[PDB]
Amino acid sequence: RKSATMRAVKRMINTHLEHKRFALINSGNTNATAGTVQNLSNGIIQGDDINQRSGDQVRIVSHKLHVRGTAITVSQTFRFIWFRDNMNRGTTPTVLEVLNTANFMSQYNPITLQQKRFTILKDVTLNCSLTGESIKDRIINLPGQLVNYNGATAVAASNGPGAIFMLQIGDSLVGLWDSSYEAVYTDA
């Protein structure tokens, strides 16, 4: 009925927009017991290319995260938290903004999750064993939202509301992890 008419309107809108693609790779990082936060959507900068943007908005159609862990010298845990910062004013968020404590086992920060500063996209835990599977990986594909920006370059000050991030935290410092990201997006 009319709801199918409106979804057809959305599809024919999307046939007139270029679906731009940005890809990213991030390899050879050590497991962090205190945790690190990695930028994902920040690499889309202002310009005229296929992985660049016009203005301070894109609209992510779909976006895909691939994480991979490798246990070195001990069996260990890799935790990856794919999340969206709905309220970013030009920073990279810290670990204690996202987690209640800077421990890999921790639950989320109660205040920032109550006020919906962050939306969790996926919480992935890889347990890599030196006597079992020492290499584990996970690929997650999700539809995206609006991404606002506060600048033109690929710095932390260009992050805006809707910026996509990944937190890595684990129980060791020795093991290694890799990451890759793509985002299909429109820039109308």
Q: What's the burial of 139, exposed, middle or buried (CB within 10 Å: 0-12/13-18/19+)? A: exposed
Does residue 133 belong to the site contacting Ca ion (CB under 5 A)?
Answer: no
Please, which residues bridge with residue 38 across strands? 166
46 binds, among a second copy, Ca ion, none (CB under 5 to 8 A by kind): a second copy
Write out the DSSP string of 111-150: HHHHTTSEEEEEEEEEEE-SSS--EEEEEEEEE--EEEBS
Strand 135-143 with 57-70, pairing: antiparallel
Residue with tokens 């991404």: 147
Does residue 3 belong to the site contacting a second copy (CB under 8 A)?
Answer: no
30, 33, 36, 106: residue in contact with a second copy (rule CB under 8 A): 106
Question: CA-CA distance, 49 to 46, in Å (whole number)?
Answer: 9
Q: Is 54 annotated as a binding residue?
A: yes
Q: Is the dihedral angle over the CA atoms 22, 26, 31, 35 positive or is it negative?
A: negative
Does residue 97 belong to the site contacting Ca ion (CB under 5 A)?
Answer: no
Does residue 110 belong to the site contacting a second copy (CB under 8 A)?
Answer: yes
153 binds, among Ca ion, a second copy, none (CB under 5 to 8 A by kind): none
Least separation in angstroms between CB 26 and a second copy: 9
Buried b (16+ CB within 10 A) or exposed e, 9-24: eeeeeeeeeeebebeb
What is the per-residue binding string for a second copy in 53-92, x denoting contact by CB under 8 A? xxxxx-x----x-x-x-x----xxx--------xxxx---
Least separation in angstroms between CB 76 and a second copy: 8
29, 36, 57, 148: residue in contact with Ca ion (rule CB under 5 A): 57
Number of residues that bind a second copy (CB under 8 A): 87
Binding residue ranges for Ca(2+): 18, 48, 54, 57, 131, 187
